[PDB]
Structure 1
């Protein structure tokens, strides 16, 4: 290969246009039906250790 190289410096406009796809999506969160805390769905509540109505995990 012959070492390809940027022909022109990217403008402030183009560099930031490229990053129009970089924003984070916020975490998907739902209230835990036992302790009302916000937690990811289909995961054991990290605050009261409950899942599927029963206690699974010590917290």
Structure 2
């Protein structure tokens, strides 16, 4: 190879347009049906240890 290198400095406009895809999407959360605390769906509730209507885990 022969060491490619940027030809011009990237403008603030360009740099920031590259970042037009960089925003985080917030965590998807559903209420725990036992203790109403918000949590990820499909996880055992880390507030109360409940999942599928039963106690799975000491919390």
Report the TM-score, using the length of structure 1 for normalisation.
0.99
Tell me which stretches of 4 or more aligned residues in structure 1 moved more than 2 Å: none
RMSD of aligned C-alpha atoms? 0.2
- Where in structure 1 are there 5+ consecutive unaligned residues? none
**Long gaps (5+) in structure 2:** none
- Calculate the TM-score normalised by the size of structure 2: 0.99
Deviations 1:3-52 (A, max 9, x none): 00000000000000000000000000000000000000000000000000
Question: Structure 2: how far apart are the matches of 1:8 and 1:19?
Answer: 18
Question: Number of paired residues?
Answer: 59
